[PDB]
Amino acid sequence: SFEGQMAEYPTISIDRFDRENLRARAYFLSHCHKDHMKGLRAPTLKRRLECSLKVYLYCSPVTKELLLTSPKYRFWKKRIISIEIETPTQISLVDESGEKEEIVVTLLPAGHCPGSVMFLFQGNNGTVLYTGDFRLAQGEAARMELLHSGGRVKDIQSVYLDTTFCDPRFYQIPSREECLSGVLELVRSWITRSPYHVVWLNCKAAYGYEYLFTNLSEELGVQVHVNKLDMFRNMPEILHHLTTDRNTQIHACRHKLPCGITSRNRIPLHIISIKPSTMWFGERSRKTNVIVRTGESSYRACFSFHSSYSEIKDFLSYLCPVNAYPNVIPVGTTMDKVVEILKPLCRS
Ligand code: NI
Ligand SMILES: [Zn+2]
Ligand SMILES: [Zn+2]
């Protein structure tokens, strides 16, 4: 499993900050999800930063902004360097001994959550790609010019990639746009009935639902109720679509409505729940409705943080690396199953 270190560049640590990663010459954070931040504010890391002054954390501008809105990560402020998207950037890896290694890093959009990137590393031990978590539609990788060298893909030694749905059963997942349209039309059909018709979006406590909130808000002229929006203080395109006020027809608040509003003018609110949920169809199956009704007032809506099996295979086929290493072992699969699934798309 992925524990922060790529074989080709062991002195850099990505999305893991404990154990062997405490000796990193440089840190990288692909996105602000708890599963990719293990040890990032551990006392032993703070201890290590105080004895190693030339050690920085690199991330996207949006990841820097989101991380530093948390008081518990503010200690990073002096040591965090943002890298502009698709802007190859020279980084020095200094042995705190005499050793000095130069690497070039390029951030590519991952389509996973605000600030989410893949890291392409170029150095004297080959080119490697760390995808972090990603959802890339067919053809998106082909359009990324900085993955190419003279009209073919770069020679990539190793890809460390998001294998969350790397199982043939998860063959196809409806597109970002198909999922959005389904939720938008369901919400529109409900809240246009009267001012007392309201929707609860039952979402996980994680970044990545903002594009759903912004679209619903833009299209229906309504602000989405959330527990907290201060992390978007300097992100106006997200911020103005959100509200902490309960008096709205679209709620994404978290533990009827979590925020406790049950009526307006003593008229009972007419509430439906919509739970963004991963849905998929098999290789030999047809796409069905992104909206699944689970009760008189309850719905599941297709939504994915991660690429389908067909999207993983298309991406890795295209990259054609020597090696592909799964970042994730799916619950009902084995690492041997995942490694062997991808082996035919690799040069070794
Ligand atoms: Ni994630
Ligand atoms: Zn993750
Ligand atoms: Zn609410």
Author numbering: 3 to 98, 100 to 258, 269 to 361
What are the paper's exact sentences on this?
As observed in structures of SNM1A and SNM1B, Artemis can coordinate one or two metal ions in its active site. Notably, a second metal ion binding site, unique to Artemis, with similarity to the canonical Cys2 His2 zinc-finger motif, is present in its β-CASP domain. Similar to the canonical Cys2 His2 zinc finger motif, the zinc ion coordination in Artemis’ β-CASP domain adopts a tetrahedral geometry, with coordination by two cysteine (Cys256, Cys272) and two histidine (His228, His254) residues.
Artemis (SNM1C/DCLRE1C) is an endonuclease that plays a key role in development of B- and T-lymphocytes and in dsDNA break repair by non-homologous end-joining (NHEJ). Artemis is phosphorylated by DNA-PKcs and acts to open DNA hairpin intermediates generated during V(D)J and class-switch recombination. Artemis belongs to a superfamily of nucleases containing metallo-β-lactamase (MBL) and β-CASP (CPSF-Artemis-SNM1-Pso2) domains.
